[PDB]
Amino acid sequence: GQLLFANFNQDNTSLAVGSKSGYKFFSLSSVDKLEQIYECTDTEDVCIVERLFSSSLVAIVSLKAPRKLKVCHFKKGTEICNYSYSNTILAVKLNRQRLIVCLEESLYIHNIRDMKVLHTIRETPPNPAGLCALSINNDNCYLAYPGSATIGEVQVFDTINLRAANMIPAHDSPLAALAFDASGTKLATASEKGTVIRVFSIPEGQKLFEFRRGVKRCVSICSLAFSMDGMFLSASSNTETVHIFKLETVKEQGRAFATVRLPFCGHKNICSLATIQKIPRLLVGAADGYLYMYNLDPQEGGECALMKQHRLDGSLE
Amino acid sequence: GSGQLLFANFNQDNTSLAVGSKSGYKFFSLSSVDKLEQIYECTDTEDVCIVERLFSSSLVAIVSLKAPRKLKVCHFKKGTEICNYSYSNTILAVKLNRQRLIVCLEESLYIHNIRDMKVLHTIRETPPNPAGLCALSINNDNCYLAYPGSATIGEVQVFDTINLRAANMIPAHDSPLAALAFDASGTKLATASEKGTVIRVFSIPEGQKLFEFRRGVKRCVSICSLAFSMDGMFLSASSNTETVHIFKLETVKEQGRAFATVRLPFCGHKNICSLATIQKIPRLLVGAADGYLYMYNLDPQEGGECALMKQHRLDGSLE
Amino acid sequence: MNEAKIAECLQTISDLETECLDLRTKLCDLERANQTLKDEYDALQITFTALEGKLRKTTEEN
Amino acid sequence: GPGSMQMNEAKIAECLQTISDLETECLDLRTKLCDLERANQTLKDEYDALQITFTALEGKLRKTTEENQ
C-alpha cells in the first residue's frame, strides 16, 4: 500500500516511516501528539530507514534500487555515500561504530566512520526474512543472526574484533525473532513454534530466563523488545495479544507480567517499550497504518489500557 | 627559535594562551600552573601579530605583519582555510564571540556573521582609535560591542551586534578612554580614562554606574588592561607601573578601595591580565612584553598582597 | 521540644530529597543532550569528509 | 503514635545522618552538572567550528561547480 516500512530508532525516541512518496521521522517525546520532525521526498518507495539514534545520519534503501544503500545527512538533504550489493538488501542495522547489511546469504560489517567493509560473512544459511539483531552498545558490540535455516541456532558475532563469539542453540524450531537489550549483554529469542521466549547472556550463552507465551495456539512471533533498563521484555506476533515479561528472579518465574490486546490482528507489527512523560509505555506500530500506545504499570502489571492511537502516515485524523 | 615576541592574549574564558611571534603562533593550555603546556603551533605564517581563537575550538583568526590589512580565518586542526578578507587599513583588533567576528580599524569597525563570515554592518567614520580600543561581549543575550564615541572625551558607544544598532552611549569619563572590558555575562562594562585614577563599572545596556574603584587621587597612570573573573566578582586593572589592583564588586562600607594588589617585577612594559581559577585556586595571570607569563594567587575572601607563585616563558622555553 | 527537631529534620529531608531528584533529572537530561550532540558531531564529521572528497574530485575533473 | 518505642535521640541521629547523605549527594550532582555543562559547551563550540568550515567548503564547491557547468 502507501506505507512500506516503520521502525523505532535505537532508544525509542524517533519513529521512522517509509512510504511510496518518501520517508518521515516522528518524535516520540509525547503521547498526545505524533509530531513530524522531518519528511523527505527525494527518494521514492523507501522500504528501509535506519537512523543513527537522534542524529542526522540515516541509511535508506528504495524499492527502485533494492540492492543499493544510501547513507545521508538528512538535515542537509545530502547523500554521504552509497554501497551496492550483489543481492536485495533485507535489513540494515547500525550503532555508533558499525553498520551491518543483511542479504539473504551474506552479511556485511561496515565501519560507520568511512563505510569501508571490515568483514563479510559469506554463504550464510538462507535468511529471506533478513532476521538479525545488532547491539546498540559500544562495549558489547555483537551481531546475532540465524546459524541454520532449519534449526533455531543463533550465531553471535563480535563486530569489533571480527570473530564468531558463540553459537547458542536457542530453539530446535527455526528462529522467528531476536533482540538485544541496551547493554548488549542479553539476547531474547523466539522460534516459529513460539512456545517459549528465551533470554541468553551474551557472549556466554547461558539461559537466563524462559517465558511461556500463553495458550498453545499456532503463533508467528514477529517482534521482541526490551525496555531501556532491561527489566521488561515484550513479545508480539500475528495474534491480537502482546505479552510483557519482567526479568526479575524473585517472582512467579516464567509467567507474563502484563498483557495488551490489540484491536488489529493478523499482520506483522513492531513493538517497543519506552518511558514517555515519566510513564512506561508499550508502543505498537501495526500494518493497519496506526501506532498504538499502551500504559504499563511497572509494579502491578496486568492488562494494559490503550491510551492513544496515531496515524503512521501523519494524518491528524 | 620563536624569534621576536609580537602578540600574547588569553581566549574568552582564560583556558588558552595565544602567542604570536616572528616564527608563527602557539597555543598553550592554562589548566595547570606548574607548566605551560603547548597544545598547538603553526609556522605556516610568519610575523603573527594577531591571534584570536573561538574559545577552545579549532577556529582561529590570524593577522601577519607581512600583510597587516588581511585577516585569515582557519580550522587549525584540519588546516582548511575558511576565509581571507582584506580591509582598507591596518587591522588593529579582531574579536570573536559565538555569533560574531569583529574587526577594528582606526576609523571603522566591521561586524561579521561568524556563521558565514559575511559583513552584516560597518560602523563608519568613528573617532580615530589608533590603539584599537574595543570590547566584545561573549554573552548571546547581551551581545554588545563597546568602542570610543569621542576622541576628546571618554564616551563609550555600546552597539548591539544582533539588532545592528546602537544600544546606548555611556559618558564614562571626562577624558579619553584608555581601557575597556566586559564581564562574561555581558552586563558589566569596566572603563578607565587616560588619567587612570578611577576604574568605573557600568551596567550594560541600560548604562547606570554600578561601581567606582580608586587607585589614585592625583597620581595618573596609563591603564592598559582591565579583566573580570568569569563570575564577575573581581576586576583587575594593570598599567605602565609595577602595581596591579584587584577590585571586588561588592557593596561595602569603604567603597572604592582595592581588595587585593600585585607587585610586578617590572615597570613600563606592555602587559595583559586575566583572572582565572586554575587547579581550584583563583589566579591573576599577567602576560608581559618581557617574555613571561606571571601567575599570582588571589584569596577571594582575604585579598591583600598576592604572591607570585609561578612564572613561565611565553615562547615555551623551560626558562 | 525534641519532637519539633524531628519535624524540622523531616521537613529538611523532604526538601533535600526533592532538590536531589530535581538535580538527577537535570543531569539525565543534560547527559541525553550531550549524547545527541556527540552523535550529531560524528554525523557532521563523516559528511564533512565526504564533501572534502567531492571537492577533490570536482576540482580534479575541472 | 501510641506504642512507639524508638528513643527520640536515636531518631534525630538517623535523620541528621540522612541529611548529610542527601547534602553530599546533592553537591556531587551539582558538581557533575557543572562538569558536564562545561564539556557540552566545549563540544558545542567545536561543532560550530566544524559547521563553519563545512559552510565554507560548501561554497567553494558551489563555485567550482557553477563556473564550469
- DSSP track, A239-287: SSEEEEEE--TTSSTTS-SEEEE-S--SS-EEEEEEEETTEEEEEEEET
Residues of chain C with Cβ-Cβ distance to D47 below 8 Å are 37, 40-41, 44
Residues of chain B with Cβ-Cβ distance to D52 below 8 Å are 59, 75, 82, 114-117
**B81 to D56: CB separation less than 8 angstroms, yes or no:** yes
Kindly state the cell numbers that stand for B225.
588592561
B81 touches chain D (CB under 8 A): yes
**D16 to C9: CB separation less than 8 angstroms, yes or no:** yes
Question: Closest approach of chain C CAs to the CA of A215, in angstroms?
Answer: 41
CA C40 vs CA A3, A109, C34, C44: distances in Å: 28, 22, 10, 6
Residues of chain D with Cβ-Cβ distance to C34 below 8 Å are 36, 39-40, 43
CA B170 vs CA A188, B156, B177, B312: distances in Å: 70, 5, 12, 39
Residues of chain D with Cβ-Cβ distance to B56 below 8 Å are 42, 45-46
Kindly state the cell numbers that stand for A204.
556466554
Q: DSSP readout, A4-64?
A: EEEEE-TTSSEEEEEETTEEEEEE-S-SS---EEEEE-SSSSEEEEEE-TTSSEEEEEETT
A37 touches chain C (CB under 8 A): no
CA A178 vs CA A50, A221, A246, A281: distances in Å: 17, 10, 17, 21
Kindly state the cell numbers that stand for A260.
495488551
Documented resolution in Å: 1.8
**C42 to A57: CB separation less than 8 angstroms, yes or no:** yes
**B57 to D57: CB separation less than 8 angstroms, yes or no:** no
Q: Residues B206, B167: contact at Cβ < 8 Å?
A: no
Which member of B57, B82, B115 has the closest CB to residue D46?
B57
**A52 to C43: CB separation less than 8 angstroms, yes or no:** yes
Pick among A55, A76, A229 to test the C interface (most C CBs inside 10 A) = A55
Kindly state the cell numbers that stand for D57.
567548503
Which member of A55, A78, A112 has the closest CB to residue C40?
A55
C42 touches chain A (CB under 8 A): yes
A182 touches chain C (CB under 8 A): no
Position C46, amino acid: I
- Which distant-in-sequence residues (6+ apart) come within 8 Å of B37 by Cβ? B28, B29, B31
The chains found to touch B (3+ Cβ pairs under 8 angstroms) are: D
A54 touches chain C (CB under 8 A): yes
Helix (H, G, I), strand (E, B) or coil at A184: coil
| Number of Cβ within a 10 Å radius of residue B302 | 8
CA A279 to chain centre: 22
C30 touches chain A (CB under 8 A): no
A113 touches chain C (CB under 8 A): yes
B and A touch per CB criterion (3+ pairs under 8 A)? no
Question: Closest approach of chain D CAs to the CA of C46, in angstroms?
Answer: 11
Kindly state the cell numbers that stand for B282.
583563583
Question: Closest approach of chain B CAs to the CA of D51, in angstroms?
Answer: 8
**D40 to C33: CB separation less than 8 angstroms, yes or no:** yes
Question: Closest approach of chain C CAs to the CA of A261, in angstroms?
Answer: 33
Note if the bond before A203 is cis, omega within 30 degrees: yes
Experimental method: X-ray
**D55 to B55: CB separation less than 8 angstroms, yes or no:** no
Question: Closest approach of chain C CAs to the CA of A149, in angstroms?
Answer: 37
Residues of chain A with Cβ-Cβ distance to C28 below 8 Å are none
Q: Shortest CA distance to B136 belongs to which of B128, B127, B145?
A: B145
Q: How far apart are CA B262 and CA B288, in angstroms?
A: 14
Q: Rounded to a whole number, what is the largest CA-CA distance in chain B?
A: 55
Query: Assign residue D61 a region: left if phi > 0, alpha if psi is -120 to 50, beta otherwise?
Result: alpha
A and C touch per CB criterion (3+ pairs under 8 A)? yes
Q: How many CB pairs under 8 A join C and D?
A: 87
Q: How far apart are CA D26 and CA D34, in angstroms?
A: 12
Q: Shortest CA distance to A115 belongs to which of A147, A84, A140, A146?
A: A84
β-strand partners of B201: B190, B211
CA A288 to chain centre: 19
The chains found to touch A (3+ Cβ pairs under 8 angstroms) are: C
Q: How far apart are CA A92 and CA A89, in angstroms?
A: 8
**C40 to A56: CB separation less than 8 angstroms, yes or no:** yes
Q: How far apart are CA B287 and CA B271, in angstroms?
A: 5
Rounded to the nearest 10 degrees, the angle between the axes of helix D8-67 and helix C2-60 is 10
| Number of Cβ within a 10 Å radius of residue B310 | 17
HSE-CB of B36 using CA atoms within 13 angstroms: 23
Question: Closest approach of chain D CAs to the CA of B86, in angstroms?
Answer: 17
CA B115 vs CA B97, B98, D50: distances in Å: 11, 9, 11
Q: How many CB pairs under 8 A join B and D?
A: 46
β-strand partners of A167: A155
C11 touches chain A (CB under 8 A): no
Query: Assign residue B229 a region: left if phi > 0, alpha if psi is -120 to 50, beta otherwise?
Result: beta
| Number of Cβ within a 10 Å radius of residue A109 | 20
Question: Closest approach of chain D CAs to the CA of B81, in angstroms?
Answer: 8
C50 touches chain A (CB under 8 A): yes
CA B120 vs CA B68, B109, B110: distances in Å: 22, 11, 8
Q: Shortest CA distance to A178 belongs to which of A125, A149, A221?
A: A221
The chains found to touch C (3+ Cβ pairs under 8 angstroms) are: A, D
Position A52, amino acid: L
β-strand partners of A19: A3, A22
Question: Closest approach of chain A CAs to the CA of C10, in angstroms?
Answer: 26
Q: How far apart are CA B307 and CA B300, in angstroms?
A: 13
Question: Closest approach of chain B CAs to the CA of D41, in angstroms?
Answer: 10
Pick among D28, D36, D66 to test the C interface (most C CBs inside 10 A) = D36
**B59 to D49: CB separation less than 8 angstroms, yes or no:** yes
Beta pairing, strands B188-193 & B59-64 = unpaired
Kindly state the cell numbers that stand for D66.
557553477
**B83 to D53: CB separation less than 8 angstroms, yes or no:** no
**C41 to D40: CB separation less than 8 angstroms, yes or no:** no
Kindly state the cell numbers that stand for B231.
563570575
A41 touches chain C (CB under 8 A): no
